[PDB]
Amino acid sequence: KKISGGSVVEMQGDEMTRIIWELIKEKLIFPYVELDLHSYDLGIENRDATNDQVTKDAAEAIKKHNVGVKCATITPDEKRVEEFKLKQMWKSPNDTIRNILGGTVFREAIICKNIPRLVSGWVKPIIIGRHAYGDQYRATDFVVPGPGKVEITYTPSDGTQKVTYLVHNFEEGGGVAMGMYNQDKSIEDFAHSSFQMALSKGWPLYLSTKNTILKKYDGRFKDIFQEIYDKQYKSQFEAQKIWYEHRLIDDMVAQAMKSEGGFIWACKNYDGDVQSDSVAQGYGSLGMMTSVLVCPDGKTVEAEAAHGTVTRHYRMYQKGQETSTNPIASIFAWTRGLAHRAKLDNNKELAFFANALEEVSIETIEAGFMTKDLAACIKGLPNVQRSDYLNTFEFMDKLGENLKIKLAQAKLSLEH
């Protein structure tokens, strides 16, 4: 009776998103879909117990099975070490997974007709390609305890030369220092996936850098995009009446803010992290955004919610208080992962189910059933009352109700 879904790597998360994750599988996915499921618990406690090995195992599973769907996870700092009694301050599971997989994370809002934006002009989608490799997420940082010299050096593999650059000589007191890097091959994959996304969408492409400040580091990104564009993409762009343009990041954020949308924005790793949260909130909620890592092999993807574990909501959950937390981004992690699974396997029954769940989610909200974040978009936050929204479970229950109806109607249809 259930759809045969194939192999999926599932990564369990923390706090409020872990609660939603279990409700998605129980209500939305498992009743209709049977999966060969490789489950990795990335909850903070299991990562601590495995010395973060479960995270690297999960990344290797995604390479093997080509599809993974990830819940948001805690990245610990000193406060989390004290809260959970951790052995170490573990690195972000996302940093580890993206470092191993590589590629570009494409992030885009999920639009409902009845939800007012915070930014008046965006009538079309903004799609951020976020380079998923290197920079601050692979970096090496340390505290400078006192006076002394920090240098960064490059030694070729043959060991026949050494280049030493002075970072800073600390004359009095200490500070911080860090190295970071990126790679030409990853930059080229990032460029290709950006131009290909623009052509698939019929939309212009913009790349943002600081190249006036980092002339070598950011100038490399700019050069590689320009060279790949001129050689391989430019005739196809003009044929679709679109263009590619590099801008300084600050000009770019101002242009995007005042634009009508409808463009692809290639972002360096850190910029794509921050701006995608600004963009998601600007369209009205961090809970309404898709995030899909498209790996360079053209086969493997990892779908996820780009927002965090929603700690403040989890604290209320721990007290038995009602929570209204937006599940949509977490649900679209599953739908986007299953859609790609169905595409790899040419599974029409699964491809239909994935799209059906996405339509149900939008239709439910557009019919007036929503969590508190979205009711705050329509009214003001100060004007919202309990009767204006559903709690987290009521909303999942409504979605489950409407999903059963949509799948029932499909079975009764002639198309079937």
Ligand X SMILES: O=C(O)CCC(=O)C(=O)O
Q: Which residues bind Ca ion (CB under 5 A)?
A: 250, 273, 277
Residue 173 CB, shortest distance to ligand NAP, in Å, is 30
The reply on whether position 141 binds ligand X by CB under 6 A is no
φ, ψ (nearest 5 deg) of residue 204: -65, 160
Question: Which class for 375: exposed (0-12), middle (13-18), buried (19 or more C-beta within 10 A)?
Answer: buried
The residue within the footprint of ligand NAP, chosen from 45, 151, 238, 251 (CB under 6 A), is 251
Are β-strands 289-294 and 244-248 bridged in parallel, bridged antiparallel, or unpaired? unpaired
The reply on whether position 390 binds ligand X by CB under 6 A is no
Identify residues 73-102 at the interface with ligand NAP (CB under 6 A): 73-75, 94
The reply on whether position 230 binds ligand X by CB under 6 A is no
DSSP one-letter string for 276-292: HHHHHHHTT-TTSEEEE
> From the list Ca ion, ligand X, ligand NAP, none, which binds 363 (C-beta under 5 to 8 Å, kind-based)?
none
> From the list ligand X, Ca ion, ligand NAP, none, which binds 373 (C-beta under 5 to 8 Å, kind-based)?
ligand NAP
CB 371 within 8 Å of CB 389:
yes
CB 294 within 8 Å of CB 106:
yes
CB nearer to a second copy: pick between 248 and 344: 248
CB 42 within 8 Å of CB 13:
yes
The interface region with ligand X, picked from 22-30, 87-95, 157-165, 186-194 by CB under 6 A, is: 87-95
Q: Residue written as tokens 């989890």?
A: 314
Identify residues 256-285 at the interface with ligand NAP (CB under 6 A): none
The reply on whether position 79 binds ligand X by CB under 6 A is no
Question: Which class for 389: exposed (0-12), middle (13-18), buried (19 or more C-beta within 10 A)?
Answer: buried
Q: How far apart are CA 113 and CA 129, in angstroms?
A: 24
How many residues bind ligand NAP, per CB under 6 A? Answer: 23
Nearby residues of 30 by Cβ (< 8 Å), 6 or more positions away = none
Question: Which class for 74: exposed (0-12), middle (13-18), buried (19 or more C-beta within 10 A)?
Answer: buried
- Give the burial string for 273-289 (b: 16+ CB within 10 Å, else e): bebbbebbbbbbbbbbb
The interface region with ligand X, picked from 76-84, 88-96, 180-188, 354-362 by CB under 6 A, is: 88-96
Residue 132 CB, shortest distance to ligand X, in Å, is 9
Q: Compose the 76-105 pattern: x for residues touching a second copy by CB under 8 A, - for all others.
A: xxx----------x--x--x----------
> From the list ligand NAP, Ca ion, a second copy, none, which binds 179 (C-beta under 5 to 8 Å, kind-based)?
a second copy
Long-range interactions of 142-149: CB distance < 8 A, separation 24+: 142/176, 142/177, 142/178, 143/174, 143/175, 143/176, 144/170, 144/174, 144/175, 144/176, 144/177, 145/174, 146/170, 146/173, 146/174, 147/171, 147/172, 147/173, 147/174
CB nearer to ligand NAP: pick between 365 and 407: 365
CB nearer to ligand X: pick between 83 and 184: 83
What amino acid is encoded at 176 in this protein?
Answer: V
The reply on whether position 308 binds ligand NAP by CB under 6 A is yes
The residue within the footprint of ligand NAP, chosen from 28, 29, 72, 357 (CB under 6 A), is 72
Are β-strands 205-209 and 126-131 bridged in parallel, bridged antiparallel, or unpaired? unpaired
Closest CA to 341 of 68, 97, 70: 68
The residue within the footprint of ligand X, chosen from 108, 273, 302, 373 (CB under 6 A), is 273
**Kind and range of the H or E element at 62?**
helix 53-65
Identify residues 346-375 at the interface with a second copy (CB under 8 A): none
Residue 277 CB, shortest distance to ligand NAP, in Å, is 8
How many residues bind ligand X, per CB under 6 A? Answer: 8
Q: Compose the 369-388 pattern: x for residues touching ligand NAP by CB under 6 A, - for all others.
A: ----x---------------
Q: Give the binding site for ligand X (CB under 6 A).
A: 75, 92, 94-95, 212, 250, 273, 306
Q: Give the binding site for ligand NAP (CB under 6 A).
A: 72-75, 94, 212, 248, 250-251, 254, 286-287, 304, 306-312, 325-326, 373
